[PDB]
Amino acid sequence: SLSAKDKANVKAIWGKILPKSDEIGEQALSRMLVVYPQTKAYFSHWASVAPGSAPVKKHGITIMNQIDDCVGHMDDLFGFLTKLSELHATKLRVDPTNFKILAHNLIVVIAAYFPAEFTPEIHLSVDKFLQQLALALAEKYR
Amino acid sequence: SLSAKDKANVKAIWGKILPKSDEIGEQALSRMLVVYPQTKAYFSHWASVAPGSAPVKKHGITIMNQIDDCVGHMDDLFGFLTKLSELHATKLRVDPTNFKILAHNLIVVIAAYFPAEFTPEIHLSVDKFLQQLALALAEKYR
Amino acid sequence: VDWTDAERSAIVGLWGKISVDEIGPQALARLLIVSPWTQRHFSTFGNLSTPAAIMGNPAVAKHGKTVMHGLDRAVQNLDDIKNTYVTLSVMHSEKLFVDPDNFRLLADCITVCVAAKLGPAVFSADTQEAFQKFLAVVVSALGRQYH
Amino acid sequence: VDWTDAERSAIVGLWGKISVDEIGPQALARLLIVSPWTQRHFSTFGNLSTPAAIMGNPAVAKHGKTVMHGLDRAVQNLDDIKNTYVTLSVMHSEKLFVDPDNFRLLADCITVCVAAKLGPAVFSADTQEAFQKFLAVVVSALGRQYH
Numbered sequence: 054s055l056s057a058k059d060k061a062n063v064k065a066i067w068g069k070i071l072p073k074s075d076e077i078g079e080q081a082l083s084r085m086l087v088v089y090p091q092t093k094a095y096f097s098h099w100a101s102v103a104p105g106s107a108p109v110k111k112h113g114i115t116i117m118n119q120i121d122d123c124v125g126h127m128d129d130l131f132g133f134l135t136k137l138s139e140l141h142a143t144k145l146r147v148d149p150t151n152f153k154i155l156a157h158n159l160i161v162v163i164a165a166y167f168p169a170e171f172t173p174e175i176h177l178s179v180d181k182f183l184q185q186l187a188l189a190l191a192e193k194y195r
Numbered sequence: 196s197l198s199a200k201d202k203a204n205v206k207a208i209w210g211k212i213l214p215k216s217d218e219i220g221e222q223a224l225s226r227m228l229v230v231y232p233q234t235k236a237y238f239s240h241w242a243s244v245a246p247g248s249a250p251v252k253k254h255g256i257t258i259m260n261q262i263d264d265c266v267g268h269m270d271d272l273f274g275f276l277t278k279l280s281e282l283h284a285t286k287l288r289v290d291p292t293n294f295k296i297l298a299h300n301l302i303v304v305i306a307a308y309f310p311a312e313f314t315p316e317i318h319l320s321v322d323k324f325l326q327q328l329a330l331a332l333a334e335k336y337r
Numbered sequence: 338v339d340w341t342d343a344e345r346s347a348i349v350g351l352w353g354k355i356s357v358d359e360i361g362p363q364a365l366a367r368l369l370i371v372s373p374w375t376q377r378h379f380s381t382f383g384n385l386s387t388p389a390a391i392m393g394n395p396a397v398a399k400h401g402k403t404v405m406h407g408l409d410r411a412v413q414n415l416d417d418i419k420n421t422y423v424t425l426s427v428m429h430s431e432k433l434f435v436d437p438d439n440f441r442l443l444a445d446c447i448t449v450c451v452a453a454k455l456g457p458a459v460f461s462a463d464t465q466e467a468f469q470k471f472l473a474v475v476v477s478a479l480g481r482q483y484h
Numbered sequence: 485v486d487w488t489d490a491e492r493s494a495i496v497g498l499w500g501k502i503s504v505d506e507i508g509p510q511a512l513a514r515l516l517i518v519s520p521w522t523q524r525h526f527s528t529f530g531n532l533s534t535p536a537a538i539m540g541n542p543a544v545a546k547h548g549k550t551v552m553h554g555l556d557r558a559v560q561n562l563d564d565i566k567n568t569y570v571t572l573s574v575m576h577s578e579k580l581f582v583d584p585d586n587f588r589l590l591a592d593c594i595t596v597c598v599a600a601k602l603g604p605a606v607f608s609a610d611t612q613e614a615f616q617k618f619l620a621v622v623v624s625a626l627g628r629q630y631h
């Protein structure tokens with residue numbers, strides 16, 4: 054569970070992330086696909102899974118918009134994510150172990166874009182946030 | 196989170212487990228230690244980590260007694276495990292990734308002892324239960 | 338991978354006491370129920386509406402046998418498992434689009450079914466240690482050609 | 485392991501362009517804060533009670549340097565990493581009792597610190613692919629002698 058300090062840290066770093074949200078989403082998704090190619094199994098219907106390609110940019114925005122929205126729902130991430138959990142479980146049938154893979158790549162991207170701001174304490178809070186987000190996405194499985 | 200059907204399935208199989216609880220604990224712990232020797236890092240202070248040895252039998256009881264009690268608290272596993280979570284995190288400093296390893300070995304042992312009863316549906320509910328138990332043990336970390 | 342003589346002996350000995358034709362169908366049916374996202378790949382296999390339907394499904398069963406006999410050549414040459422699965426690996430990646438994490442989940446179901454079949458004395462901690470090591474090498478080999 | 489020429493060049497180039505004496509302390513401090521159970525191994529190293537204390541801790545800094553210099557030999561021979569770490573693996577297991585999952589967590593902190601230092605254009609997706617592969621081989625090698 055997020056403490057008040059964790060929540061404050063997440064909101065603070067998102068102040069930096071927000072103006073670059075589309076680019077950060079593209080970067081994070083691109084890195085997930087290339088660095089962890091196991092994840093490509095879900096995206097073979099796209100015209101490309103290359104970094105910076107049209108489908109990757111488009112879906113990078115979809116992911117990051119959702120994560121941006123979650124920053125405003127940190128008091129009840131599970132309820133906020135119920136319909137999206139159902140979608141990933143029942144419609145898309147995504148093995149939920151992949152959620153932490155995306156989280157890792159987003160962390161790497163945030164570090165790359167905001168090195169001075171992404172201190173170990175901020176990193177800890179962001180990791181706690183993204184782990185809870187992953188669990189919320191896994192909630193309606195099985 | 197567990198459905199009523201999951202809870203009923205867990206209680207039903209625990210009716211088989213309880214008369215053999217001590218033996219099942221020692222089998223599950225023995226297999227964790229031997230099959231996943233990464234876990235031995237936490238038990239170097241014992242006289243032995245050999246299957247069926249006195250320290251392994253004693254601690255297998257400790258673990259299973261706790262999991263047995265959890266079956267009676269399926270409506271609030273997180274609350275029930277709050278102090279045990281803080282103990283593993285702060286006193287023992289166990290990397291929480293290990294909790295899933297113990298769960299897997301317990302599942303293997305239940306299958307070995309109750310093959311006819313441990314159907315895939317029962318297995319599914321037990322896995323859901325042990326995954327929640329692991330998350331409850333991880334809840335007070337960081 | 339470096340096998341100890343004990344591990345080598347235990348893998349060959351264990352494999353020899355199970356019927357791949359029985360365990361395969363049980364493991365695959367178990368996977369589809371315990372990790373149900375895996376059903377993504379078998380919707381053409383007929384009736385999968387219920388656990389009972391999955392358990393009685395003859396197409397699932399035939400395929401479980403194929404999976405298990407796929408492990409035969411790994412047991413046959415424990416020293417060349419990486420190269421044994423090259424073709425199978427690209428097929429599962431590029432043709433079937435199977436998330437390779439599901440190989441791990443299937444292997445865990447195979448372990449459960451073998452333990453249920455043989456019991457805790459025959460499927461001892463040391464036998465499980467060797468079998469787990471074997472399954473991990475196989476699972477790595479199956480994911481090897483994913484790019 | 486079967487490195488592509490692109491992977492080899494990416495790893496060697498990356499390693500040559502970072503300051504290991506800078507990155508090591510950063511990564512180890514990051515590990516102790518983000519994965520605090522790792523503090524188990526460093527309680528003789530002074531004050532670790534707060535993030536600031538860990539980040540300003542000189543013993544932690546020196547140790548982070550030796551970790552990174554420990555990776556030099558892997559970079560110097562990408563084709564023999566398993567043998568490079570055999571004795572270090574025995575040591576971390578039998579003398580130090582380090583849970584080898586912490587190797588993975590440290591490697592992830594190294595990635596974070598390298599990304600922060602180099603930025604997203606120099607530490608591109610392909611460079612990260614190669615560096616992740618490198619770290620995975622090292623982590624495997626460090627865990628190999630645990631029994």
Ligand code: HEM
Nearest residue numbers: 092095096115116119120140145147151152155156187190
């Ligand atoms: C963990 C953070 C994640 C978030 C916030 C997220 C969010 C989303 C959202 C908002 C959608 C659009 C759903 C709709 O159609 O209304 C989506 C779709 C999708 N997601 Fe996720 N997702 C996450 C992780 C993942 C991961 C790790 C994978 C697989 C490796 C994945 C696989 C997919 C797929 C295949 C689609 C459909 C895209 C398409 O068909 O073009 N998701 N996700």
Ligand code: HEM
Nearest residue numbers: 234237238257258261262282287289293294297298329332
């Ligand atoms: C996931 C299910 C688990 C349960 C229900 C459980 C339960 C317990 C309980 C009840 C105790 C006694 C606490 C006390 O002193 O009051 C304990 C101790 C301990 N646990 Fe766990 N535990 C679990 C998993 C693990 C795992 C996976 C590890 C490490 C691989 C671990 C490491 C330890 C250690 C080292 C002790 C102290 C034992 C000693 O020093 O003799 N636990 N556990």
Ligand code: HEM
Nearest residue numbers: 375378403404405407408425429433435439440443444479
């Ligand atoms: C122990 C791991 C596995 C092994 C050894 C294995 C092996 C095989 C083999 C030998 C074939 C037949 C290849 C041929 O026709 O030439 C096959 C096909 C297939 N496997 Fe796998 N497999 C494994 C895991 C999985 C998993 C986890 C899934 C999905 C959840 C999967 C999905 C499939 C599918 C969909 C086919 C093609 C079925 C068809 O003909 O329609 N496999 N596999």
Ligand code: HEM
Nearest residue numbers: 522525526550551552554555572580582586587590591626
């Ligand atoms: C990238 C992975 C790692 C590498 C390459 C590495 C390498 C090394 C090396 C070269 C030494 C010096 C050995 C000697 O004095 O002969 C060492 C010592 C040590 N390592 Fe590691 N290590 C790694 C990860 C870890 C982790 C994750 C931990 C604990 C969380 C750890 C705990 C220790 C401890 C406690 C010592 C001895 C400390 C001392 O005596 O001052 N290592 N390591």
